[PDB]
Structure formats: C-alpha cells, structure tokens
Coordinates of C-alpha atoms in Angstrom, one line a residue:
Chain A
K1 CA -34.1 17.9 13.7
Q2 CA -31.0 18.5 11.6
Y3 CA -28.5 17.6 14.4
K4 CA -25.7 16.8 11.9
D5 CA -26.1 20.1 10.1
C6 CA -26.2 21.9 13.4
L7 CA -23.0 20.2 14.5
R8 CA -21.4 21.2 11.2
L9 CA -21.8 24.8 12.2
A10 CA -18.7 24.4 14.4
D11 CA -16.6 23.6 11.3
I12 CA -18.4 26.3 9.3
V13 CA -17.4 28.9 11.9
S14 CA -13.9 27.5 12.5
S15 CA -13.2 27.4 8.7
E16 CA -10.1 29.5 7.9
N17 CA -11.5 30.4 4.5
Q18 CA -14.1 32.7 6.2
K19 CA -12.5 33.1 9.7
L20 CA -16.0 33.6 11.3
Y21 CA -14.6 32.8 14.8
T22 CA -13.0 36.3 14.8
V23 CA -16.4 38.0 14.8
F24 CA -17.8 36.2 17.8
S25 CA -17.1 36.9 21.5
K26 CA -16.0 34.3 24.1
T27 CA -19.4 34.0 25.9
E28 CA -21.4 34.0 22.7
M29 CA -19.2 31.3 21.2
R30 CA -19.5 29.3 24.4
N31 CA -23.3 29.5 24.2
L32 CA -23.2 28.4 20.6
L33 CA -21.0 25.4 21.6
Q34 CA -23.5 24.7 24.4
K35 CA -26.3 24.7 21.8
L36 CA -24.3 22.4 19.6
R37 CA -23.8 20.0 22.6
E38 CA -27.6 20.1 23.2
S39 CA -28.1 19.1 19.5
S40 CA -25.6 16.3 20.0
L41 CA -27.6 15.2 23.0
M42 CA -30.7 14.8 20.8
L43 CA -28.5 13.1 18.2
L44 CA -27.4 10.5 20.8
Chain B
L1 CA -30.6 -6.3 52.0
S2 CA -30.8 -2.9 50.2
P3 CA -32.6 -4.5 47.2
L4 CA -35.1 -6.2 49.5
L5 CA -35.9 -2.8 51.0
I6 CA -36.0 -1.1 47.6
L7 CA -39.6 -2.2 47.3
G8 CA -40.3 -1.5 51.0
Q9 CA -40.8 1.9 52.7
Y10 CA -38.0 4.4 52.4
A11 CA -38.6 5.7 55.9
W12 CA -36.5 2.8 57.2
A13 CA -33.8 3.3 54.5
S14 CA -32.2 6.2 56.5
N15 CA -32.5 4.0 59.6
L16 CA -30.6 1.2 57.9
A17 CA -28.0 3.6 56.6
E18 CA -27.5 5.0 60.1
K19 CA -27.3 1.5 61.6
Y20 CA -24.6 0.5 59.0
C21 CA -22.7 3.5 60.1
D22 CA -20.0 5.1 57.9
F23 CA -22.2 4.0 55.0
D24 CA -20.5 4.6 51.6
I25 CA -21.9 1.8 49.4
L26 CA -25.5 2.7 50.4
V27 CA -25.1 6.5 50.5
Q28 CA -23.2 6.9 47.2
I29 CA -25.7 4.5 45.5
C30 CA -28.7 6.4 46.9
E31 CA -27.1 9.6 45.6
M32 CA -26.3 8.0 42.3
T33 CA -29.7 6.4 41.6
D34 CA -31.3 9.9 42.2
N35 CA -30.1 13.3 41.0
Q36 CA -28.8 14.4 44.4
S37 CA -25.2 15.1 43.6
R38 CA -25.6 18.2 45.8
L39 CA -26.1 15.6 48.5
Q40 CA -23.1 13.7 47.2
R41 CA -21.0 16.8 47.4
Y42 CA -22.3 17.5 50.9
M43 CA -21.3 13.9 51.9
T44 CA -17.9 14.4 50.3
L45 CA -17.4 17.7 52.2
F46 CA -18.6 16.4 55.6
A47 CA -16.5 13.2 55.8
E48 CA -12.9 11.9 55.9
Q49 CA -11.4 10.3 52.8
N50 CA -14.8 10.3 51.1
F51 CA -13.4 11.5 47.8
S52 CA -10.9 8.6 47.6
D53 CA -13.7 6.3 48.7
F54 CA -16.2 7.5 46.0
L55 CA -13.5 7.4 43.3
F56 CA -12.8 3.7 44.0
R57 CA -16.5 3.0 44.3
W58 CA -17.2 4.5 40.9
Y59 CA -14.2 2.6 39.5
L60 CA -15.7 -0.7 40.9
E61 CA -19.2 0.2 39.8
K62 CA -18.2 1.2 36.3
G63 CA -21.3 0.5 34.2
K64 CA -23.4 0.2 37.3
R65 CA -23.2 3.5 39.2
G66 CA -21.9 7.0 38.3
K67 CA -22.9 6.9 34.6
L68 CA -24.5 10.0 33.1
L69 CA -26.7 7.9 30.7
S70 CA -28.6 6.2 33.4
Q71 CA -29.7 9.4 35.1
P72 CA -31.6 12.0 32.9
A73 CA -28.9 14.6 32.8
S74 CA -30.7 17.6 31.3
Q75 CA -32.5 18.6 34.5
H76 CA -31.6 18.4 38.2
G77 CA -30.1 15.2 36.8
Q78 CA -27.7 17.4 34.8
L79 CA -27.0 19.3 38.0
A80 CA -26.2 15.8 39.3
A81 CA -23.9 15.1 36.3
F82 CA -22.1 18.3 37.1
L83 CA -20.7 16.7 40.2
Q84 CA -20.7 13.1 38.9
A85 CA -18.4 14.1 35.9
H86 CA -15.4 14.7 38.2
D87 CA -12.4 13.1 36.4
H88 CA -14.6 10.3 35.0
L89 CA -17.1 12.1 32.7
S90 CA -15.0 15.2 31.7
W91 CA -16.4 14.8 28.2
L92 CA -20.0 15.4 29.4
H93 CA -18.6 18.0 31.9
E94 CA -17.3 19.9 28.9
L95 CA -20.9 20.1 27.5
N96 CA -22.6 20.8 30.8
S97 CA -20.1 23.2 32.5
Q98 CA -18.1 24.5 29.5
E99 CA -14.9 22.6 30.3
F100 CA -13.2 23.6 27.1
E101 CA -9.6 22.7 28.1
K102 CA -10.7 19.2 29.3
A103 CA -12.7 18.9 26.0
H104 CA -9.6 19.8 24.0
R105 CA -7.4 17.4 25.9
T106 CA -9.9 14.5 25.6
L107 CA -10.4 15.2 21.9
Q108 CA -6.7 15.2 21.3
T109 CA -6.3 11.9 23.1
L110 CA -9.1 10.4 21.0
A111 CA -7.6 11.7 17.8
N112 CA -4.2 10.3 18.8
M113 CA -5.8 6.9 19.5
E114 CA -7.9 7.0 16.3
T115 CA -6.5 4.6 13.7
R116 CA -9.7 3.1 12.2
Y117 CA -11.0 6.1 10.3
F118 CA -8.9 8.9 8.9
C119 CA -12.0 11.1 8.5
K120 CA -12.9 10.5 12.1
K121 CA -9.4 11.3 13.2
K122 CA -9.4 14.6 11.2
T123 CA -12.8 15.5 12.6
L124 CA -11.6 14.8 16.2
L125 CA -8.5 17.0 15.5
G126 CA -10.6 19.8 14.2
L127 CA -12.9 19.6 17.2
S128 CA -9.9 19.6 19.5
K129 CA -8.5 22.7 17.8
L130 CA -11.8 24.5 18.0
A131 CA -12.2 23.7 21.7
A132 CA -8.7 24.9 22.4
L133 CA -9.4 28.1 20.4
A134 CA -12.6 28.6 22.3
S135 CA -10.9 27.9 25.7
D136 CA -9.6 30.5 28.1
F137 CA -6.0 29.4 28.0
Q138 CA -3.3 32.0 28.1
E139 CA -1.6 33.3 24.9
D140 CA 1.5 31.2 25.5
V141 CA -0.3 27.9 26.2
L142 CA -2.7 28.6 23.3
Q143 CA 0.3 29.1 20.9
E144 CA 2.0 25.9 22.2
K145 CA -1.2 23.9 21.7
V146 CA -1.7 25.4 18.3
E147 CA 1.8 24.4 17.2
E148 CA 1.3 20.9 18.6
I149 CA -1.9 20.6 16.6
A150 CA -0.3 22.1 13.5
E151 CA 2.3 19.3 13.7
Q152 CA -0.4 16.7 13.4
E153 CA -2.2 18.7 10.8
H154 CA 1.0 18.8 8.6
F155 CA 1.4 15.0 9.2
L156 CA -2.2 14.4 8.1
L157 CA -2.0 16.7 5.1
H158 CA 0.2 14.2 3.3
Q159 CA -2.5 11.6 3.3
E160 CA -5.1 14.3 2.6
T161 CA -3.2 15.1 -0.6
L162 CA -3.6 11.5 -1.9
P163 CA -4.1 11.4 -5.7
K164 CA -7.6 10.8 -6.9
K165 CA -6.2 8.8 -9.9
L166 CA -4.2 6.4 -7.6
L167 CA -7.2 6.2 -5.2
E168 CA -9.5 5.1 -8.1
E169 CA -6.8 2.7 -9.4
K170 CA -6.5 1.1 -5.9
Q171 CA -10.3 1.2 -5.4
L172 CA -10.0 2.7 -2.0
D173 CA -12.8 4.4 -0.1
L174 CA -12.8 8.2 -0.2
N175 CA -13.3 8.7 3.5
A176 CA -13.4 5.1 5.0
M177 CA -9.7 4.4 4.2
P178 CA -6.5 4.7 6.2
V179 CA -3.8 7.3 6.0
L180 CA -0.4 7.3 4.2
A181 CA 3.2 8.5 4.9
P182 CA 5.7 10.5 3.0
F183 CA 7.3 7.5 1.3
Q184 CA 3.8 6.3 0.1
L185 CA 3.0 9.8 -1.1
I186 CA 6.3 10.0 -3.1
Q187 CA 5.6 6.5 -4.5
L188 CA 2.1 7.5 -5.6
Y189 CA 3.2 10.8 -7.1
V190 CA 5.9 8.9 -9.1
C191 CA 3.7 6.0 -9.9
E192 CA 2.9 5.2 -13.6
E193 CA -0.8 5.6 -12.8
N194 CA -0.2 9.3 -12.6
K195 CA -0.3 10.0 -16.3
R196 CA -0.3 13.7 -15.8
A197 CA 2.7 13.7 -13.5
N198 CA 4.3 17.1 -14.1
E199 CA 7.2 19.3 -12.8
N200 CA 5.0 20.2 -9.8
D201 CA 4.5 16.6 -8.9
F202 CA 8.2 15.9 -9.2
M203 CA 9.0 18.9 -7.0
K204 CA 6.5 17.6 -4.4
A205 CA 8.0 14.1 -4.5
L206 CA 11.5 15.6 -4.1
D207 CA 10.5 18.0 -1.3
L208 CA 8.7 15.2 0.6
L209 CA 12.1 13.7 1.4
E210 CA 12.8 15.8 4.5
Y211 CA 10.1 14.0 6.6
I212 CA 11.2 10.4 6.0
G213 CA 13.1 9.7 9.2
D214 CA 16.2 7.5 9.5
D215 CA 17.4 8.5 6.1
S216 CA 20.4 6.2 6.2
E217 CA 18.1 3.2 6.8
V218 CA 15.3 4.2 4.4
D219 CA 17.8 4.6 1.5
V220 CA 17.0 8.2 0.6
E221 CA 19.5 8.1 -2.4
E222 CA 17.8 5.1 -4.0
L223 CA 14.5 7.0 -4.1
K224 CA 16.2 10.1 -5.2
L225 CA 17.7 8.2 -8.2
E226 CA 14.4 6.4 -8.9
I227 CA 12.5 9.7 -9.1
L228 CA 15.0 11.2 -11.5
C229 CA 14.8 8.0 -13.6
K230 CA 11.0 8.2 -13.7
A231 CA 11.2 11.9 -14.7
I232 CA 13.0 10.7 -17.9
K233 CA 10.9 7.6 -18.4
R234 CA 7.9 10.0 -18.5
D235 CA 9.9 12.2 -20.8
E236 CA 10.4 9.4 -23.4
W237 CA 13.3 11.0 -25.3
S238 CA 12.9 10.4 -29.1
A239 CA 14.5 11.4 -32.3
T240 CA 13.1 13.5 -35.2
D241 CA 14.6 13.4 -38.8
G242 CA 17.9 11.9 -37.6
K243 CA 18.4 14.6 -35.0
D244 CA 18.1 14.3 -31.2
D245 CA 14.8 15.6 -29.9
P246 CA 14.9 17.0 -26.4
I247 CA 12.0 15.5 -24.4
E248 CA 13.7 16.1 -21.0
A249 CA 11.6 19.3 -20.7
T250 CA 10.3 18.0 -17.3
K251 CA 13.8 17.5 -16.0
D252 CA 14.8 20.9 -17.3
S253 CA 11.9 22.5 -15.4
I254 CA 12.7 20.6 -12.3
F255 CA 16.3 21.8 -12.4
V256 CA 15.2 25.4 -13.1
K257 CA 12.8 25.3 -10.2
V258 CA 15.2 23.7 -7.7
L259 CA 17.2 26.9 -7.7
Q260 CA 15.2 29.6 -5.8
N261 CA 17.8 32.3 -6.5
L262 CA 19.7 31.8 -3.3
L263 CA 22.7 33.8 -4.5
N264 CA 20.8 36.9 -3.3
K265 CA 19.5 35.0 -0.2
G266 CA 23.0 34.2 1.1
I267 CA 22.9 30.4 0.6
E268 CA 25.7 28.5 -1.1
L269 CA 23.8 28.0 -4.3
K270 CA 27.1 27.8 -6.3
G271 CA 27.8 24.1 -6.3
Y272 CA 24.6 23.0 -4.5
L273 CA 23.4 20.4 -7.0
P274 CA 25.6 17.4 -6.1
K275 CA 22.6 15.4 -5.1
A276 CA 21.9 13.8 -8.5
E277 CA 24.3 11.1 -9.6
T278 CA 25.6 10.4 -13.1
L279 CA 27.0 6.8 -13.1
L280 CA 24.4 5.6 -10.7
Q281 CA 21.7 7.2 -12.9
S282 CA 23.2 5.5 -16.0
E283 CA 23.1 2.2 -14.2
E284 CA 19.3 2.6 -13.7
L285 CA 19.0 3.8 -17.3
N286 CA 20.7 0.6 -18.5
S287 CA 18.4 -1.4 -16.3
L288 CA 15.4 0.4 -17.9
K289 CA 16.9 -0.1 -21.4
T290 CA 16.6 3.6 -22.3
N291 CA 20.3 4.4 -22.1
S292 CA 20.9 4.3 -25.8
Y293 CA 18.0 6.7 -26.2
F294 CA 18.7 9.2 -23.4
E295 CA 22.5 9.2 -22.8
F296 CA 23.4 11.9 -25.3
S297 CA 20.8 14.3 -24.0
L298 CA 21.7 13.4 -20.4
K299 CA 25.3 14.6 -20.9
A300 CA 24.1 17.6 -23.0
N301 CA 21.9 18.7 -20.1
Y302 CA 24.5 17.8 -17.4
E303 CA 26.9 20.2 -19.2
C304 CA 24.5 23.2 -18.9
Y305 CA 23.7 22.0 -15.4
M306 CA 27.3 22.3 -14.4
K307 CA 27.6 25.6 -16.2
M308 CA 24.5 26.9 -14.4

C-alpha cells in the first residue's frame, strides 16, 4: 500500500544521476507507467 | 418523465426513447449511467452531428454526466472511460490508453498554471518531461519539447538554488514557499546574512545579470556597483603596523576569475573590463563611510587591473 513510494519510482527511473530510463524499452516503460497509474488510482 | 420511469420497468424505456425520436438527452444519459461507451460510440457512428451534440451535452452536464469518477472505471467501466475521455478526460485517457503526448501537454499546462506550490510545479514539470520522454514523438519534436522544458528548468533552478541561510533568516518553508527571480537571487547572494559569501557567490551574482530583462529599466549598473561595493564591505580593508593591509582578496579573485583567457579564444579580452566604474564606486564608498579606509588600495588594485 505504498502508493507514494510506488509513484516515486518514476522520478527514481528518470533521475539523470542514474539514467535508468536508458535501460528500459518503450513497451516495458509504458507498462511500468500503467502500473504507476494503477497505484495512483488506489491513492485517489 | 425519465426519473419517474427509473424505478419502473426498463422494458418501456426503449419504447419511450423511440417515441421521443432523435433522443440525445435520454440515449447519452443511459449510455453514461452505465458502462456502455461502446453503445455510445455506436450511437455516434450511426447518427448525424451526434459528436457535436454529445460534446455540448457533456459540457452542459459537467459534474452530472460524462465524469469518470461516477462510473467505476477499472472494468467495462474503464472500457467506457476509454470513449468518455475524448477531449474532456485526456488525463485519465493517458492512464487508461497510454496517451503520453496528451499527458505531457496537460502536465505542462498544469505546471505553467501552478503558482501556489513551487514543489508541486517542479513535480508537474518532472512528470511532463518523463511523459514526453516516454512518448512516441519524433526526434525533432522530442528535442523541441526538451528544449522548451529545459527553459523552464533553468528558470526554476534560480529559485531552487535559494540559500539555506537566507531561507532560515526569513523563516520560509522549505517546500511550501514560492519561487524567486534573478534579481532576488542576486540580492540574497549579496545580502549581509550570507556571512560566508565568497568569490563563487560574487561570480554567481554577477553572472545572474544576463537574465534580468529590460536592463535599462531595471538599472543593471546600480546593482553592478552595489555588488562591487559589497565585495569590499565584506573585505573590510584594515591596516597593520602603520602599513596598508590588502583585504580585497575577494575582489582580486573575482577580477582574476572574470578573465577566462579569451586571448586564445578570439574574444576582445584586451580592454574588456570597462564595466566597473571608479568615480561612481567612490561615491558609494563615501556613502558607506569606508572611502578613507579603502581608497588607497582601490587605486593600487585599479592600476594592476588596467595593466592586466
């Protein structure tokens, strides 16, 4: 039930200090964003 | 008459809808109270002007019909939201159909409208940037959007670099406080509260002058003179054993760091230090009552600064 920490994964991935977005594909990142949106739904 | 038949049998609802022919208010409301946006799309396909009718109907019933929070949109209700999000609920459409470009556009609009919370504005900008990066935009459009976002990022970085000493002096909230501008940034970097103001802070408060806007109205030269006067007020030139003691070390460092060796870069470095004034600076020194202390070393330094 850590919706806030789950939504912080977007910033964790987009962080330029690690550049984790360069290791994920388009469809996989879209599915991760969909999971983040599902978590935001429960947060709402 | 529809509310009276809402408790009655629904076998006559279709009869009433067909009696009140060309039914829009009844049909779109039966398609909105249920999860039948497939039925709504079929009605929009097999009709004339039904799209412009349903748009104005949703506009009129804003908060009554067409919302995604009244229907349970995680099911066939989410299949319904898929068609009910057209141009009205694009935010939810982004979550339920992966509309990354629309998400980025809406997040950018929200960040531009955000004025209450700087932290919320920064979060919205980050989310917009992430959505744009995860979108399927072409290389050129992606680069243009990235430059547009980088402009706002550079604008926000000024307030992001607010001094933690001045913030504690002013007792401002860490994240629940507004943003600042280049003038405010320079004023805070040159404020007396900044006890550890160094050559780096002076260089920052002198490089932040290219983002002011309307330089002739904002009096760029007054601030340029004030910063140079504060760089010596913090120096506090004194005397030791009857001999002048050079405390202008900070001004010396600023003048040695202003030159980036442009002689080998092809810029007119020779004679490129006419920004600082002498008589106008001595007027401010007389106003500050430190002229009798600092005037010998001012000329001593201005000699090696015209020889350099």
